[PDB]
Design a protein around this ligand. Structure first.
Ligand SMILES: CCCCCCCCNCCCCCCCC
Ligand SMILES: CCCCCCCCNCCCCCCCC
Lengths: 291, 291
């Protein structure tokens, strides 16, 4: 069976918790926010995003929630606080794991709070609901076994680990399908091609963005149905600008911490990606998957 | 002023003359062929391509021809033989220079035969005609001063080094303009994006493909007029398949020579690029530039 893209993932997310601390919001949510109201700060928007997702799971207290690619815990920690469920978080980052583990010590609840350095490929317990925010772009990747063919194992797996009322909220960056790209009038100048290369080179090695039809094909092949396609990628512009701005604001702390080049790399990364979503070149979609 | 992309260029073209010898035609022409007649071998097609270009220069004997990015000499060596002009060749490859230099010893003529390790940025003599086949994609590159803004220096320079009847045959891979890409129905799946990244990573670091309108803008800004746009990119499929096939044919010699990975890399490179032109994602154009 499958090998998790450990080293690829670690090269990014294990860059330094203090480094990310500088420019992420306070909840350290590392995925597209949700400006449900025009006046939310970034941090309130991250809450709104977490909420928005968790609400779709029809969670009841006592249930077990699996969070795949649980980042820095915000989603788990929020799922317990606001829903009273037990949570299991999957991550491949040592830093993220270290931090979620400690962040758990703080607040208390009769609910289970587990973070693991485990891949979805290796998970094998029964759960009630599933959430994954901004991790999916790594699932087509593997320790030398990459391929969208992997989505197939994925959806069939977690269809089988969940009850008959089982639900999955898959939140992920996407790219337009043939028909829709044409319809958008999308075009790929040389600057853009250089950028993606830069991204796949300096930021997210082995990352693969799905087309909605890919998520359909493999999900339904497993028996899933999409109760909703919530396209919300426009929110990534405010998000990404916020991150970029904060990083710039801490330019001197950041150069002090992980170096000159990295400020440049990440500023370039953050500024650049903003435009991708501005231009509708990329999107973010939240699939509500049911049986 | 400008610094030539020496190390970027050397990383590719200085891979090994024996290595390229294995799969290039016998003239070792490293650019899109021209199957002027359906039955030409690759080698005859390279001649047809060289001819096709040189014919546009209205060369007379005694004239001086500058070949920019003269590759492995085929164009120079052909320009003397069939036109009786003196030739200067510019290259940044040590291997290419070594080889053209020796290849010159062989055949003889009262005509000057010069190959130099010099950039177009550094050239400063007067010439009658100018040819450049498959080098142009490196002109927007520089030793830390890349940018299409460079084309401006280029065209203004060689407008000034040539007489009033001066002509330039610019032969280069291109990419579609906005309007035309849309019209072609072009689309950039993830596989394609991964590929370009692979290309700009493992094959042609810093390479930049022009849009026809870019060549127009900068050329005319210098005073040039395009007497013809000869689009001939479809020929690159036969060319690239030929190269790929030959390399495969010599798989064992090649693995013996520069290693396992490199056979893989270059097979992947060659096979892959073929499709780019098959799909009209990229093109090849020959600009006849006049005053
Ligand atoms: C080529 C795509 C690489 C895979 C995407 C990994 C993003 C994982 N989410 C957390 C970070 C989101 C940063 C925004 C990415 C925008 C492009
Ligand atoms: C991203 C583009 C890189 C710059 C192009 C350099 C090609 C210089 N010609 C000689 C080699 C031609 C090989 C075919 C290239 C097809 C893509």
């Amino acid at each position: 069976q499958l090998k998790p893209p450990v080293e690829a993932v670690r090269s990014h997310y294990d860059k330094s918790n203090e480094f990310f601390k500088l420019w992420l919001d306070p909840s350290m949510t590392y995925s597209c926010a949700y400006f449900e109201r025009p006046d939310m700060t970034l941090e309130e928007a991250q809450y709104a995003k977490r909420k928005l997702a968790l609400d779709k799971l029809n969670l009841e207290p006592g249930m077990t929630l699996l969070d795949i690619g649980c980042g820095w815990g915000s989603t788990m920690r929020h799922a317990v606080a606001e829903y009273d469920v037990n949570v299991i978080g999957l991550t491949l980052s040592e830093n993220q794991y270290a931090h979620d583990k400690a962040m758990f010590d703080e607040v208390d609840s009769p609910r289970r709070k587990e973070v693991r350095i485990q891949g979805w490929e290796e998970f094998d317990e029964p759960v009630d609901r599933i959430v994954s925010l901004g991790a999916f772009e790594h699932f087509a990747d593997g320790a030398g076994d990459a391929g969208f063919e992997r989505y197939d194992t994925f959806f069939k797996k977690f269809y089988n680990l969940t009850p008959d009322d089982g639900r999955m909220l898959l939140h992920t960056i996407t790219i337009p399908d043939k028909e829709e790209a044409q319809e958008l009038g999308l075009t790929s100048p040389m600057s853009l091609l250089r950028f993606i290369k830069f991204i796949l080179t300096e930021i997210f090695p082995g990352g693969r963005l799905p087309r909605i039809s890919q998520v359909d094909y493999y999900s339904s092949n497993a028996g899933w149905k999409v109760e909703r396609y919530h396209r919300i990628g426009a929110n990534y512009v405010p998000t990404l600008n916020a991150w970029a701005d904060a990083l710039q604001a801490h330019k001197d702390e950041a150069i002090a911490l992980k170096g000159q080049e990295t400020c440049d790399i990440y500023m370039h990364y953050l500024r650049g990606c903003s435009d991708l979503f501005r231009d509708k070149y990329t999107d973010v979609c939240q699939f509500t998957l049911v049986k």
